[model samples]
Target chain A: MKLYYSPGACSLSPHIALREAGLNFELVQVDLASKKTASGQDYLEVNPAGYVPCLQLDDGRTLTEGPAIVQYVADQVPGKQLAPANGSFERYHLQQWLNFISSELHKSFSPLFNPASSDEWKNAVRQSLNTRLGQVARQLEHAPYLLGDQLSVADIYLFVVLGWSAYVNIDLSPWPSLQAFQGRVGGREAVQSALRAEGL
Target chain B: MKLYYSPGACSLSPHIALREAGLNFELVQVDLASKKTASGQDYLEVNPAGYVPCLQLDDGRTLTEGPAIVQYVADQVPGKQLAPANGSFERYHLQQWLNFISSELHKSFSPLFNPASSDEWKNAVRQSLNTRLGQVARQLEHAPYLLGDQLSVADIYLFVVLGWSAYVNIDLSPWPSLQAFQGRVGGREAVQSALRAEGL
Candidate 1:
């Protein structure tokens, strides 16, 4: 498997998942701005949308989208329980968190990362992020992970997104539970390996 | 089954899914501003996020998120093929499109719907939406639906989000194929039924 990523990007979710699932995969860095891979391949040909965190399976088929790829990686090692069983009710709930993190948290952080985004836009997003992060912290306050006792791909995704708080000047101290949750997840060997490998 | 929704909101995607899947369900209106249901119930008690498109099962477990809810509805009647079979390669791709529509297309339209958003912010979002819509248009141009010829939940989602263009003043004329897609998917009896029931 080949996991295409940019250091500490949302792609880090699946990169962590691959390691968590104990899967062997190669890392390929994507220069998103230049639309090229580290090896100089035009990324547009690989993913026309030019997004990162695309997973290339040995079968030669590539999967895009962090949620999808992480779930796929989880299914590969179901006993590892990175995700719930397919078709299970719990699986759909897991999907709910994944979508929430994608649309609500991750998208909210995107504008703040861009140098061109106006203060007006950035301020609006930051306020929204605080509300969204509060909700996430509430969830984590009651459980060690997003899915009760188990650490699922959703947790990995949230950890990666929360890491962006440092870059965007969003404070996490308001939610000690969230900061603790991050520390717990970040302390894992797989997550530690993934972060170190990404040079973060 | 009961689906809690706000008229013509993102909830419409799941509303359409219920009809397309031929499932029997009830619609309960939500006043997002007050976080109250039409039944005078506290909406936050049901979904803490206070978002719509919550599907309450007979067992009293409610499902949230359009992508998750639609896929759950799709699983109820696999013969309808509203989604690819779970665990299949195509299923992950379906998820990819669902996540993309949620984060990229839907999130971009969100700022435009808010009266408090600055023109500068709205303009920036509109430009990003155009690029995102172009990618969606390219996909729809080749096939009748998002996941090839079959109508999956992803297509249902894209249909609902694309419908927001009119109210937001984002022109769809640039992608005749997308317009044609709206016409094609919108013409369905189930879609028409869902829209009319929602008072759209």
Candidate 2:
């Protein structure tokens, strides 16, 4: 399998999952602005969405979307318990966190990333995200991970999005549990390996 | 099982799924603005997120988030297969659609629904949603449903979000396949029953 990635992009989640599952995969870098692969291939041909974290499977099919890609990679080695086994209620809980992160936190930060977005718009996003973050912090207040006690694909995805707090100038220190959770996931060898592999 | 829902909200996804899967579930109407149940109970006490489509299980645990609630409701029936068997590649593909609808379409329409959101922000949201809708339209151009022929939880969620298009004045006429898919799902006896139950 091969992963088309952009450094520090949401692709980091799958990169971390691949390392966690001990999967053999190649990493191909994509130039987001130019839409060019490291080998100078047209990125659009690989993924019309022109996004990162496109997992090119051994069968030559590519999977896009951060939550979907991370879950797909984790399921490849279910025994590793990188994610809850499919069909289990625990897996549904995992999916809940994945959706929460993607819709509530991740997408909320989009406007702030756009140069044309106004200060009022950006503030609205920040307010909404902080409110959602408070909920997430409360959930993590008792559990070590989103699903409790074990690192899963949700953790990887959350950590990648939390990493954006630094870029967006949003301080995560207000949520100590979340800060510690980020630390725990960041310290993992697989996560660090993925970060280094992506040259992030 | 009990499903806490708000009319015309994302909760409608699970509301439809419960009927589609032939599950017996009590629909608890949640007053979104007040964050209370129909009986005036505090919703946050039930689900910290205080969001709709929260499924309170027989075990007393509550599952939150639209995608998660729909999957949980669908899995209750052994053969209805609202979602493919968990861990199957087909299931992951369905999950991809769920994530797409949440992050791309659902979140894109969020601003327009918020009264405090500025017109500039709303316009940007509409523009982004239109682009994403084009992607959905193209994908639906060939498949009868988001995932080939069988209607799954993904379709339920997609339909719920696109259902807002008409109220928001985002036309679906351009996307014939998506329109047809919505028509077929909407025409289901169970869906019709749920709509009537919700007083739609």
Candidate 3:
């Protein structure tokens, strides 16, 4: 298996999980801005979506989409518990968190990445992110992670997205629980290994 | 089971799936603008996300997120095969489609519905939607629906997102296959039944 990634992107979450699961996979980095690989091959032909975190399976089939790819990889290793057993209600709860992070948290911060976005647009995005993060922070205050107790795929995904706060200039200081959650997740050896491997 | 929905929202997909699977579920309508149900209860209290398509299960747990809710409802009537069986590669393929529609197609149209979004933003969203729809259109050209002739949960989701195009004044004339797919799914007796039940 090979994971196509761009450094510091959402791909970092699965990178963390892959290391945590002790999976054997090759990491291929892509230059997203130029749409090329280290060898200067056009990345668009590899994935027309021109996004990072495309996982190429041993069967020669590739999986795109961050949330889907992360779940697929996590499910490959039993007892690692990156995801709950497939089709279990617990799995759906994990999925609910995945969808929430992707749609609510990730999308809210999206406009800020675009240079064409106006001050009004960025401010709206920032305010929405704070509100969503506030909800997550409150939930975290009552538990160790997004769901509870143990860390799961949702936490990895959240850690990756919340890592963008500094890049997007959104203040994470207002939410101490969130800041603590990020710090704890970052302090994990596996997560550190993934971040270091990605040159973060 | 009770499904909280707003007419023509993404929840319509789950509503259709429930009818198609012959599941017993009561429909609870909510006003999106006011965030209140017909019974005058605060909808946000039930779903902090304040989104439609919250499914209240028999166990008294409320499930939010359209894709997850649809998958759960589909699993209840296993033999009906609204979703591929759990842990199968086919199920993952179905999930891939769900994630694709939710993040790419459904959420991309959000700016068009927001009153504060500028025309430039909506136009950019429309262009992105067209590109993604083109990929879906090509995939559907070889079959009657997203996953083929059986009309799986993927079709329910695609139909709901594409249905929003009409309201946004985006023409589907260029994508004949998608238009046909939409019409075929829309013409289903169960779909029409659900629509009428929702007073659409």
User: Cα lDDT for residue A193, model 3?
Assistant: 95
- How would you encode candidate 2's per-residue C-alpha lDDT over B41-144 as one tens digit per residue? 99989987777879998889888888777877777785997888876787778878888888888878877888987888889888878778888888887777
Instruction: Tell me the whole-model lDDT of each prediction, alpha carbons only.
Output: 0.92, 0.86, 0.85
Candidate 1 per-residue lDDT over residues A1-200, each given as its tens digit: 89889998999999999999999889999998898999999998888788998999998998898889989999999999999999999999999999999988998899899898899888888988888888999999988999899899999999999999898788899999999998899999999998899997
lDDT (tens digit, per residue) of candidate 2 on A91-193: 9899899988888888888777789999999988899888999988987899889888998999889999999899889998899989988888899999888
The deviation in Å at residue A124 for candidate 1 is 1.1
**Relative to the unseen true structure, what is the C-alpha lDDT of residue A70 in candidate 3, on a scale of 0 to 100?**
80
Residue pairs clashing in model 1 are none
Instruction: Name the best candidate (by TM-score).
Output: 1
The CA root-mean-square deviation of candidate 3, after full C-alpha superposition on the true structure, stands at 1.4
- Give the local distance difference test score of model 1: 0.92
Best by lDDT: 1
Q: B42-118 in candidate 1: lDDT tens per residue? A: 99999988888899999999888898999999999999999999989999999999999998898888889999888
Backbone clash pairs for candidate 3 read: none
Q: Chain A structural similarity (TM-score) per candidate? A: 0.98, 0.96, 0.95
Off by over 4 Å in 1: none
lDDT of 3 by residue, A1-200 (tens): 88889899888877888898889999889998899977788987777778887888889877777777788878888688888887688788887888888888887777888898777777777878778898898889878898788789889999999998899787888889998998889999999999889987
